[PDB]
Amino acid sequence: SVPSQKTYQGSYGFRLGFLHSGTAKSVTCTYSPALNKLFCQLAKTCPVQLWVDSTPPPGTRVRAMAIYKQSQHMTEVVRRCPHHERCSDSDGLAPPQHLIRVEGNLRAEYLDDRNTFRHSVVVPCEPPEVGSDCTTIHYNYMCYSSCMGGMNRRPILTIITLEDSSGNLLGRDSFEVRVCACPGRDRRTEEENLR
Template sequence: MDEEENESMELPFSQDTFCDLWNNVITPSISFIPTSPTVPQCMLDNLFELGGEMDIKDGFNPSASTVPVTTDYPGDFGFQLRFKQSGTAKSVTSTFSEILNKLFCQIAKTSPIEILVTKKPPQGAFLRATAVYKKTEHVAEVVRRCPHHQNEDSMDHRSHLIRVEGSQLAQYCEDPNTNRQSVTVPYESPQLGSEMTTILLSFMCNSSCMGGMNRRPILTILTLESLEYGSCSPSLSLIGPSRGQVLGRRCFEVRICACPGRDRKTEEENKDKLQNGAKQTKKRKSTPAPEASTVKKSKSASSAEEDDKDVFTLQIRGRERYEMLKRINDGLELLDRESRNKSKASTKLDVAVPSSGKRLLQRGEKSDSD
């Protein structure tokens, strides 16, 4: 009887079980649901049901890859970069080399980069700039500023090498899996009368800084990405880092130095010398070497064809020098005449005498009959 009375009795609203209370409460957003191991089973069941109903797009990439892709990819939107022509003067703070696909800039100086697309990206698209090491033996390491420049900076993101200037919407992210750092900024459509959008990047450490890049070449990967769920904001850290679907990608090398114009000119000249040297080497290898017999024949033929009767005029300054060279020339002429006389005499002696019959008479000689 007591049990039936207890079952028929209804507890006040404040004394219901936790599962009953949970079922009567409006389910909050997934970003604010705690993940404590002491959560009751009924709460976890509802959480899993919510997770199954979430619509996740196919292109979502939850985290950055361990080895970033550094090949250019214009994508469906024709994503391109363009740099202003600054030349190689010593006074420039930023200059880009088309030959090297390399940006030369000074530390903490603004480098404008123009963004061009063939059609408008989707709503909420953003740009991401990431620095990686160029060589394969260093590509797994994270590019950070040196300790010296970090200690001098008071910003929250002082360890980031790349900084976006002129925008309050820039967000500095660090991937929890790879620890790679990047900075994002929303994509802005070109203003009226313009075909491109300009972003301002600054590089906050020299390429030669010890404890940082330490003269190791780096690449900057600039990607155009679509907005997916997730953000760098700590309030949504349960979902994951902000990694959207890549719509386009461009890469270029960066050197942060004291004199960008001079270094650009030097590297372009060195590359030109290497290319010219390689071309000359290929030409020499392709041309077959002449045979030794051919060289000897050509030399003998050329010496035989030389004509001694050619007369050359030599201008001599000074009487004394003229007399000396004249005596040398006269002596050489005398030697030539003597050699010619000797050759004539030898030809006379070499005349063949018949073994029988009449003997040939020489000039001025009388015959026996006379």
């Protein structure tokens, strides 16, 4: 009834990477290693790097899923709020209820789990472009952390899993997410609070 969040590199040495975008007021997406937390604006591009030590097999996929970070909310499905699920902003592929979208990948598949009712989005794992050392997936988060009737100011985690063609686990990584109007300011504030 709750997805595992345990970091697991597995046989291929799977882990995530993030750009260094800084904390200027104008920044739209920024990652805090000290907090393991991504701060981003609504529906803006969030580049996430996929690193392995060796190439996994053809048919390997990469899934993203959100869960609530607090234990007392973790069995609740993370979904878009009653406003945003009705604002008709679909890309023609993502169901309007899904918080997490993949941008610019026509092979993205969106799952509503028949047993758990959780949402996820999965894409084929592709090797890096010639000249690149990793593959980047572009995610969008489609509600604010503060949306009433949705996340309702509750923190979430994104869990990224590397899966074989059957959906079996090959690797797992995760990060906290705050979707907010001013990611740069909020990252600076939370990093200072931590210090």
